[PDB]
Design a protein around this ligand. Structure first.
Ligand SMILES: N[C@@H](CCC(=O)O)C(=O)O
Ligand SMILES: N[C@@H](CCC(=O)O)C(=O)O
Lengths: 276, 276
């Protein structure tokens, strides 16, 4: 039976499960401009909601969707503004001090988006340039560290979400946008002219996405992990991958044209929740 | 503007304010058996709810009542199961490490309820006796300490709420109930034979009640304290006192017959939030 102060207890007492989600983490958790929140990560959220309804024996449980940002997600989690989110949040040791993470749902590398035919091909080319990054991200930490340690004299623009960052780039307010490679591709899949944008640079990190939930709630983490493990080991996660990464997606019917990583091939066979 | 991770932000983002309340803290926050949650403390909760609706310019804001207990209130608070509660929670330094408290709304002393016809006149008379206390309370802490340090050989029965404690006493399962004096009087007011029961003993503590809210949320504490201050300094709090403590109350139409202390009168003129 759920313990006082656990998430299943909160949900049962409120009669609501509150699902945090992203607005612009494409193709993970984002708005389709068809009145829904969709994507590869959001498909896990939907599965988790069904598992909660089943566990609590409450099929008419209200489901509330609450938008969150990379900057605000931990504060909102910790006061119960939302109960869990599946999007584009990196599981790392630092964040484990504040939150818990499910089994890994995706793996990314941090790279650059830049205009084609410009002069940015590697991180070193950013010296003395304006560079945009989304506030509250691992890329913002990495980029500020690079700026200091490698003395690059970058002017770092911190934007509120990934589409704001992309539009900074698109409007010529920055020469490159640093982010998780998949998210860069996702922003390009919404662009005016997708052709105009290239992903370049050696990755500065390799990072695991997990669904995020409150710390010290083993029962809820187990529900989430068990749900993820069924999706992944049954072959369903790979079908979700193909849908969101190899086929036309909203809102512009463009294709990511990605291929499934070796890292996720191994995780779909034996799910785990380790930070990289 | 409410910061991310604050209670006003949570309320706005969820479209609801969740008010924790008691079931058996008489005459503070309790069920009237007329389909309402009522009492002297709950009157402050209603005032705070109105202040929230005004501050957020949300006149139709949903209000959800959630029952809590002495044992589960801090776990439930910390994961956002509820946003605030006004009842019978003591503000003390230890709990300030986990929660915040409003300006004080009442002051109690921890005493004993026992058969008027019986042998229990002070705490020392409890040696070798069965004594009931409500789980998760300051009285439970005090009573276990007294048992150990004074080697009293009491058999301590820990019941889930104040009415369960009283009914333990009434049914002959314990010789006395230790609790806040006002709460003892409130349970007596519901008894089969109220006249059978006496409040005895030297108080083991003097304790201040506050409404409880999350820690590190100055703006919500300020809204609550501002609301309380107006009620108290205008004379309304004493009218609420008279209503709940000097006139017949539900559910049995009996009277507490209490008098407002000079200390409370002094607080009502200049509100403050200090633990005793
Ligand atoms: N995965 C990165 C960037 C993407 C994001 O936050 O959406 C992070 O968790 O900081
Ligand atoms: N005021 C005490 C006892 C009453 C109660 O919890 O309701 C406490 O906060 O522990």
């Amino acid at each position: 039976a759920p313990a006082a102060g656990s998430t299943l207890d909160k949900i049962a007492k409120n009669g609501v499960i509150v699902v945090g989600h992203r607005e612009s983490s494409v193709p993970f958790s984002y708005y389709d401009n068809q009145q829904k929140v969709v994507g590869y990560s959001q498909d896990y959220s939907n599965a988790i909601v069904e598992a909660v309804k089943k566990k609590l024996n409450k099929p008419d449980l209200q489901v509330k969707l609450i938008p969150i940002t990379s900057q605000n997600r931990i504060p909102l989690l910790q006061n119960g503004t939302f109960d869990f989110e599946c999007g584009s949040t990196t599981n790392n040791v630092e964040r484990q001090k504040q939150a818990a993470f499910s089994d890994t749902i995706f793996v990314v590398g941090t790279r650059l988006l830049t205009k084609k035919g410009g002069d940015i091909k590697d991180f070193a080319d950013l010296k003395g340039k304006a560079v945009v990054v989304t506030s509250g991200t691992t890329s913002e930490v990495l980029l500020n560290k690079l700026n200091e340690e490698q003395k690059m004299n970058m002017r770092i623009i911190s934007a509120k979400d990934h589409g704001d960052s992309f539009r900074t780039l698109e409007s010529g307010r920055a020469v490159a946008f640093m982010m998780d490679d998949a998210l860069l591709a996702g922003e390009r899949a919404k662009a005016k002219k997708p052709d105009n944008w290239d992903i370049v640079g050696k990755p500065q990190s390799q990072e695991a996405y997990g669904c995020m939930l409150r710390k010290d709630d083993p029962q809820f983490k187990k529900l989430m992990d068990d749900t993820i493990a069924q999706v992944q080991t049954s072959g369903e996660a790979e079908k979700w991958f193909d849908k969101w990464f190899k086929n036309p997606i909203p809102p512009k019917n463009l294709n990511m044209n990605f291929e499934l990583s070796d890292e996720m091939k191994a995780l779909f066979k034996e799910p785990n929740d380790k930070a990289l």
